């Protein structure tokens, strides 16, 4: 089975937070629980009556034919929690396994046929993943700021202004909130078109229809690869500067052993009448007081914090002296691709690459040396060797459209030159509803 | 009437081409062209002049302005005080500023109330245009043609670029055009007449 | 492909004179490419041939 193939399932909190209210306003029976004694025909009856491929898990061990029915029909089981998931199924194949799952987003549009109550997509969740977890006070700060940029007076918003209690501050957090009639007891009533107005059936994130229309385009903008120029991680390695392309990442050589960085690996030790910053080496346990002579190591540093200056300088010295390959995953940086004639205006010591605050954006520069003309036949030979340490871990130049707009030998194309993508040039047409389209490819 | 929209002419995009040139490269054979074809094709051939080392597509800073609080000098949007620590100063060059910038990008697009009106336009007499440009052209076009790579066809001195662009544009699956295109809303009225460019 | 004529923008050239004994240390090492050379006065090809 392929990664898209399998038995779909989701947490109950995801169910409650999203799909359930849509089940309520669409006027359908709440989808049946599956005891595991349940017939596949019953699941068919429920998916029929609820117009979504969803059932809630109830109690242990779903039977074979029902499980295979969920599998063929892509029914989304709602597990209360993910612990020991496989125990909830009786796998005759015995091929189901924890850790064999593929986690992924599933747009509500892919399950609901009712388009009216769908204003977004994967995009917004993907954006929220980038956001730091936010105390409610930070949420208020954000809202007050967006208000400030748009010149609204958000004073006393979200606040009580009682004469004797003073001003008081309620939370502004209210994701997926709806307008709902309450019982006098204070408990919420499920929405009823017979009494409540039609406008209350689904607060569309409380945005005007046009704002949703445009919001879609904006989400398509945000999640575009070309925009995404905040880059993560850098590989430190001691090569000669020979590859012209800025996006180059040196491949790790065949003999190298991967090693997670840990404070435990480095220590003080006596060695020839001095206290060396010894690196004990996990595959064999040999201590290595000198930065030179160490085994080839693709060391990975997830988190620089708390690392000593001695240890860092020793890792660098090991990159140079023992040809260590040191990935540092914690660096967030914004690359700028220079042309050879503008050189490197902004510089970076190894020390700063090692000891910069975890949250700060670094700004690395990377040459594209594609447009560097050949040396004259009689330029003096260079005995020296230009060397390099910092490399990107991921493609930079995601923004690049064209490159090397010069001729190699009048007619030939320079290696590494890029022509614009065809899509930049495809004025298509409009679809009958008015959306932009690319030209038809081939026919029909 | 309420000012529900903001009528404009010759609109800003959300994305613009930005180019780094190595000034030392320069083709020796000067390329004379028709004055008309030079005024359609010409902003493009300047922007993608010979010796351009890199041509990126950045967010349009002229659109995503500092009035929105968005800097773009680092090549990504950044906003000063949206997602911030509470009880201390935010600190310079925080990476959170990126997330904030996306939000404001997303906000500024969510609230883009612009509505295009046709600007000054031209109807080149066709015999005055080179055939490659005459095909691309559709009767009329704004004098502010903007910049598209498809215009480099038979104009760029760089040979392989012209071969590649010619190759793509010759394929059925892609088809550049410029100016007044016939559309389903053609002849529809709304005080004035809607048209497509 | 053509040989350059305008003076080119070369990376900075650090000279490390190498003595019989010395304490090597790599604090504050440059990360950008930078040519390193052992000798001074390496501009030795002075006899130009017309």
């Amino acid at each position: 089975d392929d990664l898209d193939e399998g038995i779909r399932m989701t947490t109950y909190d995801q169910y409650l937070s999203h799909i359930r209210e849509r089940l309520h306003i669409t006027n359908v029976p709440d989808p049946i629980y599956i005891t595991g004694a349940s017939t596949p025909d019953q699941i068919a009856a429920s998916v029929q009556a609820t117009h979504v491929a969803v059932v809630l898990y109830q109690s242990g061990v779903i039977n074979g034919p029902a499980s295979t029915y969920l599998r063929e029909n892509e029914v989304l089981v709602v597990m209360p929690d993910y612990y020991d998931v496989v125990s909830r199924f009786a796998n005759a194949n015995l091929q189901m396994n924890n850790n064999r799952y593929h986690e992924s987003v599933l747009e509500i549009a892919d399950i609901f046929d009712q388009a009216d109550f769908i204003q977004t997509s994967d995009a917004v969740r993907q954006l929220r993943a980038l956001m730091p977890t936010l105390s409610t006070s930070q949420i208020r700060h954000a809202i007050e700021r967006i208000a400030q940029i748009t010149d609204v007076d958000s004073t006393d918003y979200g606040k009580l202004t009682l004469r004797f209690l003073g001003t008081l501050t309620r939370s502004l957090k209210m994701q997926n909130a709806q307008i709902r009639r309450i019982r006098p007891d204070g408990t919420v009533l499920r929405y009823d078109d017979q009494i409540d107005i039609e406008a209350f059936r689904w607060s569309r994130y409380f945005l005007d229809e046009l704002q949703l229309r445009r919001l879609s385009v904006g989400l398509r903008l945000i999640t575009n690869p070309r925009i995404a120029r905040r880059f993560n991680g850098v590989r430190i390695m001691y090569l000669t500067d020979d590859d012209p392309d800025p996006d180059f990442v040196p491949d790790v050589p065949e003999g190298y052993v991967a090693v997670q960085y840990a404070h435990r690996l480095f220590s003080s030790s006596l060695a020839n009448k001095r206290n060396r910053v010894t690196y004990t080496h996990p595959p064999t346990g040999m201590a290595y007081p000198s930065p030179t002579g160490r085994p080839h190591v693709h060391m990975t540093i997830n988190e620089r914090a708390g690392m000593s200056k001695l240890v860092a300088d020793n890792i660098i010295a090991s990159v140079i002296k023992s040809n260590w390959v040191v990935d540092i995953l914690d660096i967030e940086y914004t690359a700028e691709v220079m042309t050879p004639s503008e050189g490197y205006t902004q510089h970076v010591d190894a020390e700063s690459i090692m000891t910069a605050p975890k949250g700060k954006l670094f700004h690395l520069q990377f040459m594209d040396g594609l447009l560097r003309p050949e040396p004259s036949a009689f330029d003096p030979p260079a005995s020296g060797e230009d060397m390099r340490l910092i490399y990107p871990l991921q493609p930079i130049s995601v923004a690049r459209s064209m490159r090397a707009i010069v001729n190699h030998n009048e007619v030939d194309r320079p290696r590494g030159a890029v022509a614009p993508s065809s899509y930049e040039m495809d004025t298509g047409t409009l679809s009958r509803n008015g959306d932009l389209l690319y030209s038809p490819v081939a026919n029909g | 009437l309420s000012d529900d929209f903001k009528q404009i002419s010759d609109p800003k995009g959300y994305l613009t081409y930005s180019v780094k040139y190595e000034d030392q490269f320069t083709k020796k054979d000067k390329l004379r062209a028709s004055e008309a074809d030079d005024r359609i094709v010409g902003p493009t051939v300047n922007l993608f002049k010979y010796g351009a080392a890199v041509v990126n597509i950045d967010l349009n800073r002229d659109f995503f302005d500092t009035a929105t609080g968005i800097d773009l000098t680092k090549g990504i949007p950044l906003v000063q005080d949206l997602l911030v620590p509470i009880g201390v100063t935010a600190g310079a060059e925080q990476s959170a500023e990126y997330v904030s910038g996306l939000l404001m990008v997303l906000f500024k697009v969510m609230t883009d109330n612009r509505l295009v009106i046709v600007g000054e336009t031209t109807t080149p007499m066709s015999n005055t245009l080179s055939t490659v440009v005459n095909n691309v052209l559709r009767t009329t076009y704004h004098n502010n043609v903007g910049v598209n790579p498809a215009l480099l066809r038979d104009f760029t001195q760089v040979n392989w670029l012209n071969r590649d662009i010619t190759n793509m544009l010759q394929q059925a699956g892609t088809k550049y055009g410029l100016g007044l295109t016939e559309t389903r809303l053609d002849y529809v009225r709304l005080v004035k007449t809607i048209v497509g460019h | 492909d053509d040989v350059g004529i305008m003076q080119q923008k070369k990376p900075p050239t650090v000279v490390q004179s190498r003595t019989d004994v010395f304490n090597e240390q790599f604090a504050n090492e440059a990360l950008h490419p930078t040519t390193k050379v052992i000798f001074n006065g390496l501009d030795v090809n002075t006899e130009v041939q017309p």
């Binding site: 042309t339 050879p340 004639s341 503008e342 | 903001k6 009528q7 404009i8 002419s9 010759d10 609109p11 800003k12 613009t16 081409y17 930005s18 180019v19 780094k20 040139y21 190595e22 000034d23 030392q24 902003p43 300047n46 922007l47 080392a53 950045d58 349009n60 800073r61 002229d62 659109f63 009106i117 600007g119 502010n144 903007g146 910049v147 | 350059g4 305008m6 003076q7 080119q8 923008k9």
Partner: peptide, 26 residues
């Protein structure tokens, strides 16, 4: 002379829609 580098981005030319008093059509 020393070799050099330069940059250019496409410029904004957006303007509020012109008010014309003349009319194209009867």
């Amino acid at each position: 002379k020393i070799a050099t580098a330069s940059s250019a981005r496409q410029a904004d030319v957006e303007k509020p829609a012109d008010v014309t008093f003349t009319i194209e059509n009867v």
